[PDB]
């Protein structure tokens, strides 16, 4: 890349020297050396870029967000200076956007990428990176407009196809998403070999009846994305024991299980009381997992945080669960009531993480019509009995009874997770 303008060429020696100290690993000596060059040559783009890059490296060594915030500002200063080479301008602001996302300043990254796409209107890779910005903030409509433009200029961009297909699939355009996801993955372009697109292509195929879904599940497994054709979670810790169905003894959570089964009617009655007197606290499932039916959930704990208002509706149940941090502290699971009505079929799906196990306590179980498949075995609920499975495996649910089915869902940390992993793992 051409990063030295005319003036920077007259001082290339002084610049390469400081870059040497950085490449060697003496960051503190390089920040001071680029800082002195910026003092001496206030309009040098390469010297400003070097200071920002040394600040970037220093923040990593210290794990400092304050230092990284400084590098982000220095990266912008490179773009305010005069006669900045175009390769240097793009590198500086792309890194600004990238590191802006690591801190969680998504709106800042978006603004930086918008400026990049305006300064360089013909670089499709930047528009593609801007579409990711919109996806990370939850704006699927603006990400759609972007990838449509990319495909209208470069029709064979695989990165844009998979992302466009991902958007269409999230909009419930299952039939329309399959061609974009499949071609995008087959393109082999950079960024297309991602587990998310294998996951969503097979699911789309499974929904329209196409039996080729498992071939894509198999490919994702062979390419290291999925741990198995059945276990297709993507936010995983490797090494944890993996089986569809668990027994209470296998989990080691015998006290939690005994407590739920000994006191099950109490948990049932508080949930029925909310159904009768506070139905609005039951919220519909909003993840597009149903083919048909009514599925609603009343959530007491999520991401290890207690819903104060919900626990006022189920006060005794919440007091009971406080004694068991294996579930109340599961920052990758929930504790919730779940009601399903007749005529409901939940598509085959997996949960996001392998770091939890899911317990089902039966509360109101119709005698017929209710069944849950996990992997290749189908089981039924029983009132007052706990059922334990790993929802990271593909599971499917039917409700073809004559009345409603109420269960209590309790997520626990996977038993083989160390106490440290249980405190560090980001929440889901």
């Amino acid at each position: 890349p051409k990063l030295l303008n005319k003036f920077d060429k007259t001082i290339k020696a002084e610049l390469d020297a400081a870059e040497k100290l950085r490449k060697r690993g003496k960051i503190e000596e390089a920040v001071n050396a680029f800082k002195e060059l910026v003092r001496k040559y206030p309009q040098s783009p390469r010297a400003r870029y070097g200071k920002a890059q040394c600040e970037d490296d220093l923040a990593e060594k210290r794990r400092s967000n304050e230092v990284l915030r400084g590098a982000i500002e220095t990266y912008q200063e490179v773009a305010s200076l005069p006669d900045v080479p175009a390769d240097l301008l793009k590198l500086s602001l792309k890194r600004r956007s990238d590191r802006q996302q690591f801190l969680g300043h998504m709106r800042g990254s978006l603004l930086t990428l918008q400026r990049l796409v305006q300064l360089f209107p013909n670089d499709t890779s930047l528009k593609n990176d801007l579409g990711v910005g919109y996806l990370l903030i939850g704006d699927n409509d603006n990400a759609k407009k972007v990838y449509e433009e990319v495909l209208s200029v470069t029709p064979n961009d695989g990165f844009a196809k998979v992302h466009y297909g991902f958007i269409l699939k999230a909009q419930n355009k299952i039939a329309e998403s399959i061609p974009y996801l499949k071609e995008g993955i087959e393109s082999g372009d950079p960024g297309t070999d991602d587990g998310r697109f294998y996951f969503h292509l097979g699911d789309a195929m499974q929904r329209v009846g196409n039996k080729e879904a498992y071939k894509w599940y198999e490919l994702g497994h062979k390419r290291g994305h999925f741990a198995s054709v059945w276990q297709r979670s993507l936010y995983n810790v490797n090494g944890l024991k993996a089986q569809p169905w668990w027994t209470p003894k296998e989990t080691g959570y015998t006290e939690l299980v005994k407590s739920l089964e000994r006191n099950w009617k109490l948990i049932r009655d508080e949930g029925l009381a909310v159904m009768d007197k506070a139905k609005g606290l039951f919220l519909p499932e909003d993840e597009n997992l149903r083919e048909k039916g009514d599925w609603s959930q009343f959530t007491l704990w999520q991401q290890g945080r207690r819903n104060e208002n919900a626990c006022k509706g189920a006060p005794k149940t919440c007091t009971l669960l406080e004694k068991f941090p294996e579930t109340t502290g599961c920052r990758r699971g929930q504790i919730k009531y779940s009601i399903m009505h007749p005529g409901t079929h939940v598509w085959p799906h997996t949960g996001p993480t392998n770091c939890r196990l899911r317990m089902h306590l039966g509360l109101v179980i119709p005698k017929e019509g209710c069944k849950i498949r996990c992997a290749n075995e189908t089981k039924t609920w029983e009132e007052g009995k706990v059922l334990i499975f790993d929802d990271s495996f593909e599971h499917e649910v039917w409700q073809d009874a004559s009345s409603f089915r109420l269960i209590f869902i309790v997520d626990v940390w996977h038993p083989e997770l160390t106490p440290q992993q249980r405190r560090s793992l980001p929440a889901i």
Binding site: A59, R63, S64, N65, L68, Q101, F102, L103, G104, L135, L136, G138, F166, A170, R196, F199, S233, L234, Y235, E285, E287, N288, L289, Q302, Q334, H349, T350, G351, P352, T353, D391, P426, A427, I428
Partner: peptide, 17 residues
């Protein structure tokens, strides 16, 4: 958020170091 499924482009949230 990713509760029962994996429908979001990202299920986690970045907060820096």
């Amino acid at each position: 958020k990713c509760k029962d499924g994996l429908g979001e482009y990202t299920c986690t949230s970045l907060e820096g170091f």
